[PDB]
Design an enzyme around this catalytic site. Structure first.
Site, PDB file in Angstrom:
ATOM      1  N   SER A 159       3.214  35.022 -32.689  1.00 32.29           N
ATOM      2  CA  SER A 159       4.353  35.465 -31.893  1.00 32.29           C
ATOM      3  C   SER A 159       4.324  35.074 -30.411  1.00 32.29           C
ATOM      4  CB  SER A 159       4.475  36.973 -32.009  1.00 32.29           C
ATOM      5  OG  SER A 159       5.077  37.247 -33.237  1.00 32.29           O
TER       6      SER A 159
HETATM    7  C1  LIG Z   1       4.034  37.528 -34.271  1.00 36.32           C
HETATM    8  O1  LIG Z   1       2.904  37.560 -33.863  1.00 36.32           O
HETATM    9  C2  LIG Z   1       4.501  38.403 -35.488  1.00 36.32           C
HETATM   10  N1  LIG Z   1       3.456  38.600 -36.492  1.00 36.32           N
HETATM   11  C3  LIG Z   1       3.637  38.468 -37.815  1.00 36.32           C
HETATM   12  O2  LIG Z   1       4.731  38.281 -38.341  1.00 36.32           O
HETATM   13  C4  LIG Z   1       2.350  38.544 -38.656  1.00 36.32           C
HETATM   14  N2  LIG Z   1       2.480  37.844 -39.948  1.00 36.32           N
HETATM   15  C5  LIG Z   1       1.883  39.976 -38.848  1.00 36.32           C
HETATM   16  C6  LIG Z   1       0.552  40.314 -38.646  1.00 36.32           C
HETATM   17  C7  LIG Z   1       0.126  41.626 -38.783  1.00 36.32           C
HETATM   18  C8  LIG Z   1       1.024  42.615 -39.123  1.00 36.32           C
HETATM   19  C9  LIG Z   1       2.348  42.289 -39.335  1.00 36.32           C
HETATM   20  C10 LIG Z   1       2.774  40.977 -39.204  1.00 36.32           C
HETATM   21  C11 LIG Z   1       5.055  39.724 -34.850  1.00 36.32           C
HETATM   22  N3  LIG Z   1       4.398  39.879 -33.572  1.00 36.32           N
HETATM   23  C12 LIG Z   1       3.289  40.835 -33.644  1.00 36.32           C
HETATM   24  C13 LIG Z   1       2.868  41.229 -32.236  1.00 36.32           C
HETATM   25  O3  LIG Z   1       3.801  40.960 -31.380  1.00 36.32           O
HETATM   26  O4  LIG Z   1       1.788  41.737 -31.945  1.00 36.32           O
HETATM   27  C14 LIG Z   1       3.722  42.043 -34.530  1.00 36.32           C
HETATM   28  C15 LIG Z   1       2.494  42.700 -35.157  1.00 36.32           C
HETATM   29  C16 LIG Z   1       4.593  43.079 -33.821  1.00 36.32           C
HETATM   30  S1  LIG Z   1       4.709  41.227 -35.854  1.00 36.32           S
END
Ligand SMILES: *C(=O)[C@@H](NC(=O)[C@H](N)c1ccccc1)[C@@H]1N[C@@H](C(=O)O)C(C)(C)S1
Ligand SMILES: [Co+2]
Ligand SMILES: [Co+2]
Ligand SMILES: [Co+2]
Length: 452
Positions: A159
């Site tokens: 992200s």
């Molecule tokens: C970007 O980092 C996003 N992460 C995901 O879609 C992962 N596949 C994921 C990991 C763990 C749990 C859920 C999803 C979004 N950004 C993250 C962040 O900003 O820290 C999030 C956990 C909010 S989802």
């Protein structure tokens, strides 16, 4: 008959010495490499071999500059030139220590951090945990980090990559911070299904909220407005897939699949930071572009060289690259303040509220990217690269900070969770205190991440 060149020293931007030679005895005359800071910035500096030439790091990549050429009697000895780094020893020391204790407190396999000057892209600090000590025999330090993962070891960013999409929807007039969206809890796109990290129905997230709350679905819907060509162009303009030329050995180029090789699902993955890899330095350089009013200045660690007479030559500055307008950059800086915004009702809270520093317009973006299972060719479910990147401050960018934690069990400060936000908080806050940068009594009104 032989007249020996005296090895040059490596110093920081204020001429504070990192490595220097003293004359000694045993041949009989024997020059000793001195490392007063021990492990300080040894990931960058490197260390000496038996013959007094560089073994690794800048001692070796810049050996010819540092070693000079031996004389003879008739040819005069050319003593080694001094190498001035962009590093600030005080900042590097604080950062390197925090990185070590972030690794200890969080249980990560590794932790690294880069600090860039916002306007100039210079590397003010570059640190990893577990840094070897170049004043000691390297062969006794197999349990140490001997290299420089911040430039050598790319990861999938997850992200934190959402700056690209955000910069593209703004620059191309395709959305605005305050636009109210309708974001489902999942979409099918490019043959695949993308879910937000929380289950939800259709939510009235603003574009500000899509990035402040890190909605994958929202990021992808905004990315459909941009299209592959314009999005892939913004990736490239942001410097991804290509070495920066920072002046450090072993730099990786990362990895961005070119647009003519995309599969039906590439576009469903890249805007959320999966399917491509980058180094910590490339990651921080993306935020440098936004901090520098949309103009990316490739990072540099070599500041200047001093010749044996004492004459100084400044290192040549790399050319500006215009990624986005100044107006775009300012608008993205302000949106990203939502990531550190705190709300007791939850409604208008971003993902990284512990990264905010009260009295300052801190701005950043969190990330949680899944790592690849080596024995599978598929993603782990619960092994992550945690990542934070931020600008201090939005209204007056001075420092760009990029952090990665390799799969922590806890926050960087030891609290439960998996966030790098507390470490950005520590470093950014300390950078503001030490320069006596003035507070701001009003933060502005709260930003709206979620409408009605
Ligand atoms: C970007 O980092 C996003 N992460 C995901 O879609 C992962 N596949 C994921 C990991 C763990 C749990 C859920 C999803 C979004 N950004 C993250 C962040 O900003 O820290 C999030 C956990 C909010 S989802
Ligand atoms: Co001759
Ligand atoms: Co957990
Ligand atoms: Co604090």
């Amino acid at each position: 008959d032989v007249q020996p060149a005296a090895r040059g020293s490596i110093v920081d931007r204020n001429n504070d010495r990192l490595a220097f030679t003293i004359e000694a005895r045993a041949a009989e005359r024997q020059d000793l490499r001195q490392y007063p800071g021990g492990s300080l910035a040894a990931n960058v500096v490197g260390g000496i071999d038996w013959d007094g030439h560089g073994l690794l790091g800048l001692e070796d990549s810049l050996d010819a500059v540092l070693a000079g050429t031996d004389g003879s009697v008739r040819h005069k000895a050319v003593h080694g030139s001094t190498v001035v780094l962009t590093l600030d020893n005080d900042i590097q020391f604080y950062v390197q220590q925090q990185v070590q204790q972030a690794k200890n407190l969080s249980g990560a396999h590794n932790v690294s951090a880069v600090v860039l000057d916002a306007k100039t892209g210079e590397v003010l600090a570059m640190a990893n945990d577990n840094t070897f000590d170049p004043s000691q025999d390297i062969g006794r330090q197999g349990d140490k980090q001997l290299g420089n993962p911040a430039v050598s070891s790319p990861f999938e960013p997850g992200s934190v990559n959402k700056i690209v999409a955000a910069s593209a929807v703004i620059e191309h007039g395709l959305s605005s911070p305050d636009e109210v969206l309708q974001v489902p809890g999942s979409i099918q796109m490019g043959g695949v299904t993308v879910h937000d990290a929380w289950e939800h129905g259709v939510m009235p997230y603003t574009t500000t909220g899509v990035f402040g709350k890190s909605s994958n679905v929202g990021t992808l819907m905004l990315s459909q407005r941009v299209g592959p060509e314009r999005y892939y162009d913004m990736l490239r303009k942001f410097g991804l897939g290509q070495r920066t030329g920072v002046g450090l050995p072993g730099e990786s180029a990362g990895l961005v699949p070119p647009i003519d090789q995309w599969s039906g699902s590439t576009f469903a993955n890249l805007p959320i930071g999966q399917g491509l890899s980058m180094t910590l330095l490339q990651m921080t350089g993306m935020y440098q572009a936004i901090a520098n009013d949309g103009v990316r200045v490739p990072p540099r660690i070599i500041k200047a060289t001093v010749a044996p007479d004492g004459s100084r030559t400044e290192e040549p500055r790399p050319d500006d690259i215009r990624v986005v307008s100044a107006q775009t950059a300012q608008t993205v800086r302000q949106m990203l303040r939502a990531v550190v915004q705190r709300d007791p009702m939850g409604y208008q809270q971003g993902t990284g509220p512990t990264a905010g520093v009260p009295g300052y317009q801190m701005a950043g973006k969190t990330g949680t990217a899944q790592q690849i299972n080596p024995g599978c060719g598929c993603y782990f479910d619960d092994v992550y690269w945690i990542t934070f990147a931020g600008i201090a401050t939005a209204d007056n960018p001075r420092y760009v900070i990029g952090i990665m934690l390799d799969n922590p069990a806890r926050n960087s400060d030891g609290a439960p969770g998996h966030s790098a936000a507390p470490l950005f908080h520590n470093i950014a806050g300390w950078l503001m205190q030490r320069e006596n940068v003035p507070l701001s009594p009003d933060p502005g009104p709260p930003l709206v991440l979620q409408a009605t």
